[PDB]
Amino acid sequence: AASVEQREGTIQVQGQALFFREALPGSGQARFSVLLLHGIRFSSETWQNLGTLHRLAQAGYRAVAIDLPGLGHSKEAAAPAPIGELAPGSFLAAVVDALELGPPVVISPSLSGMYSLPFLTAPGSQLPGFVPVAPICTDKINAANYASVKTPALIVYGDQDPMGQTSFEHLKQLPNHRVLIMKGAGHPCYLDKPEEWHTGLLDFLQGL
């Protein structure tokens, strides 16, 4: 195909440089943008090697994966908050603004929950789609705020992941959601069953 991918992996966000990898259609046109976050043991590089950025690009989407503060090639950036608490919801807004992605579908697994959830619930921040993958901090957002989010959600998790069921109890409070349970998969379920993950993901993005 004619998929263009760049890793100018550098944008200034709240005074710090963050690394990012990107893949887009090539014509330069895309239905909308998809922002991918990562777990503490991974980074944007994991999405690249898994083929996700490329897959999404050839399907007509602009795919952008960043490295969160202190991880990956963003090692010298300082995290806005410590593991244990929510990061400012305005952090990802700055990210989106620097890359000029426009309202994006946010894929948020594990650790990134601390960044994505506060953003999903930020004032006036109505996203096109949200794809949580056993995020942390789901219990830090109260029912009232979850019920206020109208953005479509695809709750994905592996049935072998104890955080799957736990986080689901809170996430199910999202008004518009669908569940994608990956049988025989663990916490990083997208790595255990790539085909099932990519198929479910694309199917979801199509219905937006």
Curated annotation (Swiss-Prot):
It is found in: Cytoplasm; Nucleus. InterPro entries: AB_hydrolase_1, AB_hydrolase_fold. One of its GO terms (cellular component) is cytosol. This is Putative protein-lysine deacylase ABHD14B. The modification N-acetylalanine is found at A1. The modification Phosphoserine is found at S90. GO terms for molecular function: hydrolase activity; protein-lysine-acetyltransferase activity. Its EC number is 2.3.1.-. The active site is at S110 (charge relay system), D161 (charge relay system), H187 (charge relay system). Its main location: cytoplasm. Acts as an atypical protein-lysine deacetylase in vitro. Catalyzes the deacetylation of lysine residues using CoA as substrate, generating acetyl-CoA and the free amine of protein-lysine residues. Additional experiments are however required to confirm the protein-lysine deacetylase activity in vivo. Has hydrolase activity towards various surrogate p-nitrophenyl (pNp) substrates, such as pNp-butyrate, pNp-acetate and pNp-octanoate in vitro, with a strong preference for pNp-acetate. May activate transcription. GO terms for biological process: 3'-phosphoadenosine 5'-phosphosulfate metabolic process; positive regulation of transcription by RNA polymerase II. Ubiquitous. Detected in spleen, thymus, prostate, testis, ovary, small intestine, colon, peripheral blood leukocyte, heart, placenta, lung, liver, skeletal muscle, pancreas and kidney. The gene is ABHD14B. Keywords: Acetylation, Acyltransferase, Cytoplasm, Nucleus, Phosphoprotein, Transferase. May interact with TAF1. Transmembrane segments: none annotated. Belongs to the AB hydrolase superfamily. ABHD14 family. It catalyses: L-lysyl-[protein] + acetyl-CoA = N(6)-acetyl-L-lysyl-[protein] + CoA + H(+). Pfam families: Abhydrolase_6. It comes from the Eukaryota. It comes from Homo sapiens.
